[PDB]
Structure formats: structure tokens, C-alpha cells
């Protein structure tokens, strides 16, 4: 009955040399780590070491070409770092980026290993750069390699290929990369909640809509919960978990839960424009703990308000550690959120008896 925590300050080295105020800041992870220490959560966790992912582990989800191109950035001069970064949608690269991306992934592999060998029950990974926009063949949206997707494959690689992995992506952005990597796969259930605005919200693709339910044997194993019509918060997230995320997850019966835990749906986030509270994140976490005999790994994705992300992720770790959830879903839903939830219910009732 132990919670693992992984954090390595070396992941701060990845930086934007042209815009030191770019929101994907080095201090995102050091601020979260500090708050864990302040709240005396850190001393209650078992510290899991970071490590580098290997290139063979990266190839679980990524092309050899993509891996080698990002690796080639290690010795580039600034002009070529700028040129390479510009080939992608919303990427900056420094000489340390590749190393940091390897540490973020390797850290999560060690955490998944710790859970699956029984060394810990659950774990939190305070890592950057993030992962869920990264595609098999390309970088995107501050992400180089798809850490959560890789971790799902890594977990299968030390157990069995068909190990049932649930990935819950509550970053305010759609994890386009994660959806695509698993779109034809019934062994990995992908559930994302995300601001959509009929395609106006990053990453601006209809792939994020509720009617994208998976392909082939993966049909039904991709669940998009898209928000339209501005600010959402605890009531809408709690309702989506109540009507969709938890009934589907229970029916799937995952053997491991990975959370693509961005905290940019948080109150105060400059990119997300939503108002999920730290208490709200605590309740989301506590619900997921009822799955997979408690085998939950929380992986940092986005989240850009340093105070908001520090408080929110610390609350998640407090839940993992077995603390009582804080008092909380204070309001009727925005009408467009009701419409969203009902659209997803209609889209997935053919696949999940729990929705009928
Ligand atoms: K998401
Ligand atoms: K899937
Ligand atoms: Zn995000």
C-alpha cells in the first residue's frame, strides 16, 4: 500500500532559447515537486528513479525516422534548432530536449514497472516535456514522444501484449497522438475530455469529436468527450465521469490505469480557460483509484499556471496516498455540456452495455 513518485530536475534543461516566457516552462515541474515537499506528500512516497528510455522502447510507438530526427537535435546550433522546431506544429527545441524527452518516458516506464511488480500500488510522474500530442512519426504541441502511449506499450511488454490499459486524458487538449496510436487497438481504451469548440481549439481537428469511436477491432475503444461553448468546471467534469468515464472504464475492466494528467483545465490556466478546482482533480483521481485494483499512474501532461498545477497535482497525489477526498460538483451543468455528454452517450451505447 505504497505510492511511488518520480521527479528529476534534469528534465528542467529543455528550454525555449528564443522566448523564455513560453508557457511550457522548466519550473512547471520544480514548482509541482516543491509543493509536494511543502505539503509533506513527498516524504510519504517511495521515490522511483528516473532513467532514460532506450531507442528500442521509443520504437514501441514511434518511427525510426522520427526518433533519429529528434535525436539529431542534440548537437544542433541554434539556427538549425529553430529550423527543425518550425517543421512541427507548436514545438521549440534546445540541445537538451531529446534527453529530457527520454527521461520523461523512462521515468514513467520505471513507475509502471514499480506498480506491475508490486513494489508500489500507484504512482505519480512529475515529468516534462509532455507527450500526448506526439504522433508515431511527428512531434506536436510541445510534445516529442508520446510518453503515456509508450508506457502503455511498455507495460504490455513486461506482462502480455493484450494487457488491458485504460488511458484517461484529462488535459484540456485532445491527445491526438494517443488516439491515433491506439485507434485500431482494443487492448488500450483511450478516454479523453477536452475543449473542442467545433475545431477552433488546439489541435483544431475533427478527430477530437465524439463520433470518432475507434477503428476495426478498436471500434468502441476510443471515447472523446468534447466541450463546446466556453468555460467548464467541476460540475461538468464530475458529470462526465459519472455518466461516461466510470461506467465505461468499469465495463472495460482495465488491468492498469494511466492518466494523461494535464492540469490546464484548471482554474487560472491561461490556455484552457476552464475552472476545474484542485478538489475537483482530487475527486477525479479518487474515482479512478476504484479501477484496476488501484493500479493508477498519474503522468503530467500540460497545465501552465504554476500555482494551479502545483496545487492540483499535489491533491491527486494526496488521493493516491489514501487521504480522504476534500469536500466538493456545486452546480447544474452548462447546457452545452449536457449536449456533449448526451452526444457521447449516443455514440457509445452501441459498444457499452453500461450506457444503455
Ligand atoms: K484530453
Ligand atoms: K483504442
Ligand atoms: Zn493541454
Amino acid at each position: 500500500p505504497i505510492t511511488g513518485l518520480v521527479y528529476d530536475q534534469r528534465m528542467m534543461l529543455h528550454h525555449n532559447m528564443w522566448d523564455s516566457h513560453h508557457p511550457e516552462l522548466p519550473q512547471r515541474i520544480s514548482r509541482i515537486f516543491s509543493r509536494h515537499e511543502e505539503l509533506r506528500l513527498l516524504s510519504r512516497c517511495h521515490r522511483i528513479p528516473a532513467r532514460l528510455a532506450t531507442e528500442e522502447e521509443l520504437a514501441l510507438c514511434h518511427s525510426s525516422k522520427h526518433i533519429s530526427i529528434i535525436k539529431s537535435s542534440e548537437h544542433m546550433k541554434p539556427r538549425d534548432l529553430n529550423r527543425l522546431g518550425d517543421e512541427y506544429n507548436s514545438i521549440f527545441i534546445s540541445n537538451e530536449s531529446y534527453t529530457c524527452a527520454l527521461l520523461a518516458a523512462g521515468s514513467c516506464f520505471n513507475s509502471a514497472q514499480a506498480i506491475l511488480t508490486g513494489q508500489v500500488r500507484n504512482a505519480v510522474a512529475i515529468v516534462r516535456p509532455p507527450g500526448h500530442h506526439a504522433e508515431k512519426d511527428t512531434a506536436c504541441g510541445f510534445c516529442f514522444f508520446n510518453t503515456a502511449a509508450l508506457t502503455a506499450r511498455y507495460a504490455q511488454s513486461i506482462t502480455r501484449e493484450s494487457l488491458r490499459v485504460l488511458i484517461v486524458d484529462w488535459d484540456v487538449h485532445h491527445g491526438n497522438g494517443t488516439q491515433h496510436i491506439f485507434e485500431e487497438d482494443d487492448s488500450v481504451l483511450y478516454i479523453s475530455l477536452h475543449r473542442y469548440e467545433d475545431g477552433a481549439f488546439f489541435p483544431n481537428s475533427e478527430d477530437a469529436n465524439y463520433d470518432k469511436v475507434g477503428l476495426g477491432k478498436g471500434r468502441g475503444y476510443n471515447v472523446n468527450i468534447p466541450w463546446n461553448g466556453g468555460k467548464m468546471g467541476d460540475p461538468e467534469y464530475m458529470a462526465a465521469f459519472h455518466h461516461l468515464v466510470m461506467p465505461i472504464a468499469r465495463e472495460f475492466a482495465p488491468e492498469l490505469v494511466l492518466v494523461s494528467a494535464g492540469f490546464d483545465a484548471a482554474r487560472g490556466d491561461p490556455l484552457g480557460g476552464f475552472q476545474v478546482t484542485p478538489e475537483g482533480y482530487a475527486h477525479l483521481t479518487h474515482q479512478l483509484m476504484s479501477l484496476a485494483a488501484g493500479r493508477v499512474l498519474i503522468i503530467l501532461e500540460g497545465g501552465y499556471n504554476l500555482t494551479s498545477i502545483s496545487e492540483s497535482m499535489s491533491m491527486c497525489t494526496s488521493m493516491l496516498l489514501g487521504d480522504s477526498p476534500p469536500s466538493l460538483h456545486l452546480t447544474p451543468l452548462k447546457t452545452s455540456a449536457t449536449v456533449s455528454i448526451n452526444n457521447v452517450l449516443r455514440a457509445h451505447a452501441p459498444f457499452w452495455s453500461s450506457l444503455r
Side-chain angles (χ1 to χ4, degrees), residues 20-292:
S20 64
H21 299 126
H22 187 287
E24 209 287 87
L25 289 169
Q27 50 265 47
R28 291 169 65 248
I29 57 169
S30 56
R31 283 284 301 272
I32 292 164
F33 184 75
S34 288
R35 191 61 180 147
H36 279 74
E37 185 177 63
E38 287 163 14
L39 295 168
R40 311 207 281 273
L41 298 168
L42 175 62
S43 61
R44 300 169 60 194
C45 293
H46 165 77
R47 192 68 178 274
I48 294 169
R51 73 169 168 88
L52 301 171
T54 71
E55 298 180 44
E56 172 170 353
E57 287 163 341
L58 295 186
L60 289 164
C61 300
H62 297 284
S63 67
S64 64
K65 180 175 186 177
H66 177 56
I67 298 166
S68 86
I69 295 172
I70 300 310
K71 183 174 180 184
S72 74
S73 69
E74 286 206 298
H75 300 98
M76 282 181 184
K77 310 243 168 65
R79 175 159 77 164
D80 294 310
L81 287 166
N82 177 48
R83 290 167 164 171
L84 173 58
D86 282 358
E87 292 179 17
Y88 309 103
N89 185 343
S90 303
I91 287 289
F92 64 85
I93 316 180
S94 65
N95 288 141
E96 307 94 339
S97 297
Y98 176 70
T99 290
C100 290
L102 296 183
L103 288 172
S107 291
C108 292
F109 303 159
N110 277 353
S111 297
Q113 182 183 40
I115 293 163
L116 290 169
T117 60
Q119 181 172 44
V120 306
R121 169 162 304 173
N122 56 38
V124 61
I126 305 167
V127 294
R128 66 181 287 273
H132 68 156
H133 297 302
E135 301 272 6
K136 169 176 188 170
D137 251 274
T138 205
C140 183
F142 311 165
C143 306
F144 295 93
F145 307 120
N146 193 319
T147 297
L150 289 165
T151 297
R153 291 302 193 209
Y154 170 80
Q156 292 176 335
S157 84
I158 59 167
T159 50
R160 58 168 213 285
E161 276 196 17
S162 56
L163 183 79
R164 292 186 306 280
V165 183
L166 162 69
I167 299 176
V168 173
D169 185 333
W170 71 42
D171 189 282
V172 78
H173 299 93
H174 186 235
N176 50 287
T178 312
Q179 162 167 319
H180 291 144
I181 288 162
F182 301 113
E183 208 167 351
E184 308 187 48
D185 199 325
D186 59 352
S187 68
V188 181
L189 168 60
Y190 180 64
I191 305 179
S192 176
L193 309 91
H194 44 274
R195 196 163 175 201
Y196 178 56
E197 306 294 358
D198 291 318
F201 201 79
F202 189 87
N204 309 105
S205 168
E206 293 189 42
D207 295 354
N209 211 358
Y210 60 83
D211 61 343
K212 310 305 192 295
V213 299
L215 292 166
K217 71 176 184 308
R219 200 152 172 89
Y221 294 87
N222 193 81
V223 182
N224 284 331
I225 303 174
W227 307 119
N228 306 297
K231 319 194 180 199
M232 304 298 172
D234 294 348
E236 289 78 21
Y237 277 70
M238 292 294 285
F241 263 59
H242 177 246
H243 292 288
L244 290 164
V245 181
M246 294 303 303
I248 294 173
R250 283 177 205 115
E251 188 166 355
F252 179 63
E255 293 162 285
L256 177 65
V257 178
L258 304 184
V259 189
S260 267
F263 294 99
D264 42 7
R267 181 187 62 220
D269 194 272
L271 289 196
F274 275 12
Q275 53 191 353
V276 183
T277 68
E279 293 78 14
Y281 286 112
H283 281 260
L284 299 189
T285 301
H286 187 259
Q287 292 180 49
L288 295 181
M289 292 173 61
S290 67
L291 304 166

